[PDB]
Amino acid sequence: KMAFTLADRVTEEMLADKAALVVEVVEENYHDAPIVGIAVVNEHGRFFLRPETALADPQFVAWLGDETKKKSMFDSKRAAVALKWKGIELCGVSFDLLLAAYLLDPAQGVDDVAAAAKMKQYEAVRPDEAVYGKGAKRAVPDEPVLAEHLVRKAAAIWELERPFLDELRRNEQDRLLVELEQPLSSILAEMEFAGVKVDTKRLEQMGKELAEQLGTVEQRIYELAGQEFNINSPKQLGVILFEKLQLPVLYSTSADVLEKLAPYHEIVENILHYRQLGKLQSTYIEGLLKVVRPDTKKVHTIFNQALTQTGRLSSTEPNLQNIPIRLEEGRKIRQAFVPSESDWLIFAADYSQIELRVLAHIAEDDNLMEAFRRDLDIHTKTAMDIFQVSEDEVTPNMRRQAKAVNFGIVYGISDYGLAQNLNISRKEAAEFIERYFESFPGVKRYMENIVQEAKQKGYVTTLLHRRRYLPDITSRNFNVRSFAERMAMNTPIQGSAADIIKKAMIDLNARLKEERLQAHLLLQVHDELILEAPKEEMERLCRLVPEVMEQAVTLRVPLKVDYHYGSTWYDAK
DNA sequence: CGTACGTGATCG
Ligand SMILES: Nc1ccn([C@@H]2O[C@H](COP(=O)(O)OP(=O)(O)OP(=O)(O)O)[C@@H](O)[C@H]2O)c(=O)n1
């Protein structure tokens, strides 16, 4: 057993100017969720507090909100947001063990204190899953069990801060934690708590029309197949296509396959159309409506800041980072995302080709840097170079194929992978790649060098010193090793872009505050920032937002930001 | 050829 005081009231010694603090929210989605318990560990001892008591105590609430009273936590954003829903401000979080663990090694998948602790041979704390259970059997245990668990977590955080900070310093990542990820955590908390207003009537109207079109195409499919079957079943669909109708096998029924089969039978295009409507209906209408809060008609995503292996955020419940845009039918979903106040507008700013600009910078490729210095259309320029033609001679198919090469280069180029993407032979794809590297020899040297460096050091890094370990780079299995080489090529690009936009968000918020604008961030989608603001602020934002985003870092090429605003997210185009 | 998440089907 670990010793602690199970307090009935808050005392002064619990309010020291440095503590490990646990404000426990067990529900996965912490929005408007209960706080089940509080633990504090500091120089004076270890304390468990009941939240109905602590959170009603003015001295404790003042302590929580006092920036000069420093707290060490794990996933402080969870606590901060749960407290925001209770009208309580959390300040002074100086160390977040989740973010520290994430920066040291995102591959550990650390999502509880016990997992972080094990990184430093500290095992005197249980995994959350062992305490709460998983799935439907999940539950908050009785007080003695709960209290001991929260105290052990606080004690672990209290013990682990120094070793974690020491290692971050050794890796030259301590500023990344303290000046980037931790401040960003607070900004993410604000964005999540603000939420995004949804026009549910509009979504419901779209739902109704979709359902009608769905019925129509569904019956057309049955008529064409000469029978009814579950179109969403791969088994049944595969039978209909490849046995009853005898279509060729190029069973995979992925979209790319169906697109190749479309010429053989009228049913195929109907099946694609059906899947597409069904996607919109199930995921982007019905699924979105399920998570809208009925009182305020807002969705409050959770941005997972300690999940991706490259330093990107992810977004859940709902995922607001994969709302359709490419095809008009799906893009209309965005008409349902609206400003939260009357006479406000949505303002969206996106980096133009940030990944290829970062590549130009890190590779110091003269041709690619010159292309961005001239603000050329990069896909047209790449086509000119690889196909050896003048700008006026670049055909649409050529630009399309060059664009695909540009994607492959950023992802970690593969002849089989590019070949798959363009529906061409491996030798054909290999020729394109060779021509690319002939035109961009700095990029080739960079790709060769970064793989060698990954092998030598064991990891790759981003501009702001994020790291990703790549143990498979030495595998004697070709496929395993090749995937690791692709990660070595891609991670510094994708990850540096993530560093840049994170810093831009911090810089933007500081400027917004200085200027006392009411404008605020709502979402980030990897290389874009979505805000809402009074209509009277648009002219100022048109100058401020792109400037801050462009100046977040200084590269060997310019950063370029495009922007638009409108009455809904759809119209901010 | 990179990084995510949600869904419906499947399947233990
Ligand atoms: N102790 C440190 C040093 C650097 N960085 C990160 O790395 C970035 C660039 O570091 P910087 O020192 O300014 O440039 P370099 O000289 O290239 O790096 P180094 O420390 O090796 O000299 C910083 O902005 C920061 O994000 C950090 O997180 N912690």
Q: What is the CATH number of the domain that holds A416?
A: 1.10.150.20
Who contacts A280 (Cβ-Cβ below 8 Å, separation ≥6)? A206, A210, A324, A329, A330, A333
Q: Is A412 near strand B, with its CB below 7 A from some atom of it?
A: yes
Domain with A454, as residue range(s), is 354-497
Pairing of strands A196-198, A337-338: antiparallel
Whether residue A463 is found in the same domain as residue A511: no
| A470: its two tokens | 């790549």
**A399 CA to B8 C1' distance (Å):** 37
Breaks in chain A listed by the residue before each, with C–N > 2.5 Å: 250
Burial A325-337 (b: 16+ CB within 10 A, else e): eeeeebebbbbbb
- In the structure encoding, which two tokens stand for residue A155, read together? 């004690």
Listed residue (A283, A139, A154, A136) closest to A206, CA to CA? A283
A425: tokens are 């032979």
Separation CA A383–CA A393 (nearest Å): 10
Q: How is residue A496 written in tokens?
A: 């540096």
Is residue A164 domain-shared with residue A210, that is, in the same domain? no
Task: List, in sequence order, every residue forming a beta bridge with A532; answer none if it has no partner.
Answer: A346, A520
Residue ending a domain, choose from A497, A524, A556: A497
Same domain, A363 and A466: yes
Whole-number Å distance, alpha carbon A104 to ligand 1 midpoint, is 15
Beta strands, E only, A427-571: 459-461, 467-469, 520-524, 528-534, 561-566
Please say which residue of A164, A193, A222 terminates a domain: A193
DSSP lists the bridge partners of residue A558 as none
Number of H helices, E strands in chain A: 24, 17
Torsion sign, CA atoms A214, A216, A222, A228: positive
Within this chain, do residues A42 and A169 fall inside the same structural domain, yes or no? yes
- In eight-state DSSP terms, residue A35 is P
Please check whether residue A131 is in contact with residue A141, taking contact to mean a CB–CB distance below 8 angstroms: yes
Which residue, counting CA atoms, is nearest to the C1' of nucleotide B4? A314
Select from A162, A156, A173 the least CA-distant residue to A116. Answer: A156
Contact predicate A72/A157, CB 8 Å: yes
The tally of CA atoms less than 13 A away on the side-chain side of residue A322 is 13
CATH classification of the domain holding A341: 3.30.70.370
Tokens matching residue A273: 């159309």
Same domain for A253 and A154: no
Beta bridge partners of A197: A298, A338
In ligand 1, which atom is closest to the CA atom of A177?
A: 28
- Round to whole Å and give the CA distance between A567 and A267: 39
Question: Could you say which of A148, A167, A193 is where a domain stops?
Answer: A193
Residue A388 backbone zone (phi > 0: left; psi -120 to 50: alpha; other: beta): left
- The two beta strands, A37-42 and A18-24, are antiparallel
CATH of the domain at A221: 1.20.1060.10
Shared domain check, A183 and A332? no
Query: A357's torsion region: left (phi>0), alpha (psi -120 to 50) or beta?
Result: alpha
3-state secondary structure of A566: strand
Domain check: are A344 and A492 in the same one?
no
- Indicate whether A183 and A203 sit together in one domain: no
A108 touches strand B (CB under 7 A): no
Give, in degrees to the nearest 5, the angle at Cα A47 between A43 and A48: 160
Measured CA to CA, the distance from residue A67 to residue A72 in angstroms comes to 12
CA distances to A207, A303, A327, A505, A539 from A568, in Å: 18, 22, 17, 22, 17
Same domain as A182, residue A33: yes
Task: Give the bridge partners for A19, in sequence order.
Answer: A71
Atom of ligand 1 nearest to the CA of A176: 28
CA A538 to each of CA A338, A346, A513, A528, A531: distance values in angstroms, whole numbers, following the listed order: 16, 9, 16, 17, 11
Task: Give dist(CA A534, CA A548) in Å, integer.
Answer: 19
Could you give phi then psi for residue A38, rounded to 5 degrees? Answer: -130, 140
Resolution of the coordinates, Å: 1.7
Which method was used? X-ray
Nearest 5°: phi and psi at A49? Answer: -125, 140
Q: Give which of A493, A437, A436, A485 is closest to A461, Cα–Cα.
A: A493
| CATH assignment of the domain containing A170 | 3.30.420.10
Beta bridge partners of A525: none
Residue A272, number of CB atoms within 10 A of its CB: 17
Please name the residue ranges forming H helices in A113-181.
113-118, 128-132, 143-170, 174-175
Q: Are residues A446 and A549 in the same domain?
A: no
Q: Which atom of ligand 1 is nearest to the CA of A169?
A: 1
Q: Which residues contact A403 (CB under 8 A, 6 or more apart)?
A: A379, A382
Q: Whose CA is nearest to atom 9 of ligand 1?
A: A464
Instruction: Give the total number of structural domains in chain A.
Output: 4
Pocket test for ligand 1, best of A465, A500, A555 (most atoms within 8 A of CB): A465
CA–CA distance, A472 with A34 (Å, rounded to integer): 42
Structure tokens, A84: 């925001």
Nearest to A22 by CA among A4, A388, A166: A4
With the C-alpha atoms ordered A93, A98, A103, A104, is the resulting torsion angle positive or negative?
A: positive
Q: How many CA atoms lie within 13 A of A570 on its CB side?
A: 16
Same domain, A50 and A148: yes
Report whether residue A174 contacts ligand 1, using a CB cutoff of 6 Å: yes
CA distance A371 to A360: 9
Give the E-state strand segments of A43-147 in sequence order.
Answer: 45-49, 70-73, 93-96
For atom 16 of ligand 1, which residue has the closest CA? A172
Span from the CA of A181 to the centroid of ligand 1 (angstroms): 14
Pick the residue whose CA is nearest to atom 3 on ligand 1.
A172
Paired sense of beta strands A45-49 and A467-469, if any: unpaired
Same domain, A127 and A10: yes
Place of tokens 């041979």: A121
- Of all helices (H) and strands (E), which one includes residue A304? strand A302-304
